[PDB]
Design a protein around this ligand. Sequence first.
Ligand SMILES: Nc1ncnc2c1ncn2[C@@H]1O[C@H](COP(=O)(O)OP(=O)(O)OP(=O)(O)O)[C@@H](O)[C@H]1O
Ligand SMILES: Nc1ncnc2c1ncn2[C@@H]1O[C@H](COP(=O)(O)OP(=O)(O)OP(=O)(O)O)[C@@H](O)[C@H]1O
Ligand SMILES: Nc1ncnc2c1ncn2[C@@H]1O[C@H](COP(=O)(O)OP(=O)(O)OP(=O)(O)O)[C@@H](O)[C@H]1O
Lengths: 360, 357, 353
Amino acid sequence: GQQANSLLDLMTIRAFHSKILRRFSLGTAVGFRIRKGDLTDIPAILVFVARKVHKKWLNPAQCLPAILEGPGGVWCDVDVVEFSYKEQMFSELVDKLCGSDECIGSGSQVASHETFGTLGAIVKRRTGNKQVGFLTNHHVAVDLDYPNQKMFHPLPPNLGPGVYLGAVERATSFITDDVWYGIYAGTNPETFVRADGAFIPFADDFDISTVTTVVRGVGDIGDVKVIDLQCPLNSLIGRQVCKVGRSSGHTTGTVMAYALEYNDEKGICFFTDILVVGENRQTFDLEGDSGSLIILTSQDGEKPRPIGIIWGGTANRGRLKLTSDHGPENWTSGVDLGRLLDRLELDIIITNESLQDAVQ
Amino acid sequence: KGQQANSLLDLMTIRAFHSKILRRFSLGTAVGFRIRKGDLTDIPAILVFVARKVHKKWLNPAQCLPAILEGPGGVWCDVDVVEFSYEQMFSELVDKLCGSDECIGSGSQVASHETFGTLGAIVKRRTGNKQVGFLTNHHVAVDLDYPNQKMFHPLPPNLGPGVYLGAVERATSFITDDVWYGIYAGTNPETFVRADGAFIPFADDFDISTVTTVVRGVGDIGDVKVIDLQCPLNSLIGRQVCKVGRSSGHTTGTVMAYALEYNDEKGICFFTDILVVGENRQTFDLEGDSGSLIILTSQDGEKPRPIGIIWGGTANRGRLKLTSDHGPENWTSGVDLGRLLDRLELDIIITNESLQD
Amino acid sequence: QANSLLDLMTIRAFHSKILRRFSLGTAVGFRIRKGDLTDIPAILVFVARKVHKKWLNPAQCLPAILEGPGGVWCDVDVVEFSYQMFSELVDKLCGSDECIGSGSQVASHETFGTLGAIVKRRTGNKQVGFLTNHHVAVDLDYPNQKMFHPLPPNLGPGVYLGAVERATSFITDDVWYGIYAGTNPETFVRADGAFIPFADDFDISTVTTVVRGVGDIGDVKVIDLQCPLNSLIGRQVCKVGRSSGHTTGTVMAYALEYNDEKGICFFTDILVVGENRQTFDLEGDSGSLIILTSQDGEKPRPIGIIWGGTANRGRLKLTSDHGPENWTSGVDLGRLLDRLELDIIITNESLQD
Ligand SMILES: Nc1ncnc2c1ncn2[C@@H]1O[C@H](COP(=O)(O)OP(=O)(O)OP(=O)(O)O)[C@@H](O)[C@H]1O
Ligand SMILES: Nc1ncnc2c1ncn2[C@@H]1O[C@H](COP(=O)(O)OP(=O)(O)OP(=O)(O)O)[C@@H](O)[C@H]1O
Ligand SMILES: Nc1ncnc2c1ncn2[C@@H]1O[C@H](COP(=O)(O)OP(=O)(O)OP(=O)(O)O)[C@@H](O)[C@H]1O
């Protein structure tokens, strides 16, 4: 008879009641109840519909209950959100990240022969030789069917001047929920979590001595921050995050929901990790920022800690409307950094001391 | 040496008397107040809508319209040359008129299986059953490619949640000028005015107890104000009007011309009744506002009076230049409420105690 | 065993729930086996694709026998639905003639069409005219159009025929058929029809009653819903159209029921397919008269009017070593006549008087 106070409890409650909510919803996530336009502190399951019609034009069989109970007597609220399923910045930071700098690092532009992207972090393989490289999104890194994919910065040789970074070695795709979350967050045989990743070691002839580990526009970042499923709920949802992109530069935002699910028509259930909406009714990211690091804003004057990377373009998928008298605002979807570094056995490099010593 | 134009009727027949030279090089013609230097004056005139207003140095005398016309009994009036061509709001009212409220009324969103529209008002038929329904335009109501077209609010069941309102009962199509105005306004055997409208009865099992007469943004409206065609010209032209729409919310405007006539290539001459332009170069209605009530803004502190409804959502039909320091601004066309209340015989409900009878 | 149409629609109405699960439509006719029609009454089930009964779930295998009230049984057939001629007749039906008649080209300001038969209202003034399809006759937002032959004055030389007076919209099956053919509150039997009176100043002396290319037709033939099944299904039909000219065909099925994703049930009356793997009407023959081929030295009798515009649309795909064939939909010209209360002037004596 207790109230949910962690992400695991809400995820288990949604798993118990997966069939009721999905009947008239375009998606479902777990977070904080949104009332009168801003987050409250009451845990709730956020269900996503296409329109919020007053419950006077709804038959009784379409009015979702506001309270659900799960295993062991855990209850939580139900909140209904109105979901929906090119302004490039010009500044001194975008120019440097697009290749007008003397060094490469996080937020820099990485390109293939066909698509652009954004450099993520500078990572390290935890096993074997422990080569040095970087990690990004495979939708900009791996072309489905050319046999080899090479990395160039800023542009490929067939499009402009650039240098050859490396080749894709390991790439990730949708994985089962059991390995990712550790629980059965659903009643479907085929539930996959989309977490793109790509480890590209630097070439043996590369000039790696002109790379940096500090984030341009954020300063110095700390060690990676893992997301625990049984921690207080106000530790992930409702916090302040930032991003450095090649197209939009430094942008700020906040975390709105966790564990977004889509349920395509063919029957496969796809989970999306994080939901980020920009601040001051701005956009958190453009299209082309896929790969940029997502870092929590420093609190009580500590070192900011990356918590994930941007999946890609969410404008095509749609936007969301927070209860207000203003127009809808788009969102941004992320991926957990911890279980994307564990699945690839990668280590975050924050300073040059761990870079110089491990380049041997 | 005679009398000057001083009203709408019998000085609009002056255009009928001279409908031979007016439309040779013009896209249309209306009657109202002369516009000079961008402001509306008080001299009655006949506005001539051309697609390009050049200075009188590059015109042969053939296409130079005179500034004075004559009619029956020695009546004269001026001639005006006007340049004339032929994304919803996000606020709280817009949200309340699309299903976020607990009541329905004028300005509410009414939808069919294909189109979108706005609720006109709450009405009663003056004979027979006397059931309380509502009225709108038919470009949203009727379809002749379906036997039944039903109304849902906010959305049809095949597009989203909603409630069933009713079906179309009466919708008079384009109607001739003789019964509408009374005068033979034109020398064309086939002259029609597009008085689109549709009376839609409420469902038998529809909850009446959740509908209202409040305009939701104008306050309380009075009895319908008929456009009497024997009053001075300063009774319709130049007054302030307003509307409530599902897309554009609540806006305001002014009346510039009356009885705008349009002739197509096939030969049929079509009259449009009311010309409205926005204030401060703002728009008066978006696309999807067709069927919204047009209400005169009340002066001297009386109750506002509805005088018409919006014909169609304008984005393609209308652009006119008033001043030579700003770009063209679109206009909105309306239909008289009071002769559309006669061919669709009705009675407007203005209080909440006329809903319980 | 059913031996008529009346008890053939009744079984489908009784079993209109299991059939609609995996079908694009349903009609009543004769069983088709190996590409030819048999003499066994059956119910045609129009699926999107034919597969062998081994890649199908047990609930997706439609039974071959259904029963209805009164202990009457019928077979079930599964069909695979897939929902200008240059001659001297096409020229004479397009404006080169010295007279107007059946099969002539009639045009509105927007669309083209085809004249049907010369008709006469049975009450009131009894003034002559003609009847055709309203998707040519009526422009909806302008009810009473003017009729011109061959072309409107804004498109070419022509003469003014008249203006539409009465037009037929969707009709419910209660008045049309008589039986409640369907357990659906909204079942519509949308028979196109439009009587266009001739103008008072029309010459009328240049109007014929013989069908160009068929000769002299007899009186109209009504379709009785309870008769021997080989009286309508399996017969030979023909037409005279403005676009394709004379063309022969064969009636395939009766009372076709197509569906739309709105919940409202519709009905189509007559199914016709071409002969020798040809097309029955290409485009613009909407309104052409459907006439049974003369049998045993008789006079051909009109039995329907083409709905039209179903060549670049519906294909009657067969699973017997060939490409899809085109089907044409028609409407019974006995009830289109009755509910508009008209006649059929078959000879010159009834036109003059
Ligand atoms: N399937 C549905 N589609 C559209 N609207 C619905 C549906 N189900 C419920 N609603 C409406 O959603 C309303 C509640 O949204 P919500 O759950 O957030 O309440 P809230 O947070 O208290 O209020 P607020 O709207 O102020 O954010 C319900 O009370 C009902 O009016
Ligand atoms: N067919 C035409 N096309 C373009 N311009 C025309 C045409 N006919 C007349 N004009 C010119 O329009 C000008 C007159 O406009 P108007 O009729 O408004 O007078 P006005 O009200 O005194 O001036 P304004 O409104 O511009 O201050 C004259 O130069 C007139 O010749
Ligand atoms: N829903 C369906 N979709 C596709 N195919 C089906 C379906 N149901 C049945 N079938 C196949 O259709 C076959 C029969 O078609 P039909 O009913 O006409 O038999 P038939 O006339 O004896 O043979 P023929 O195919 O020679 O015309 C079934 O026996 C089965 O093989």
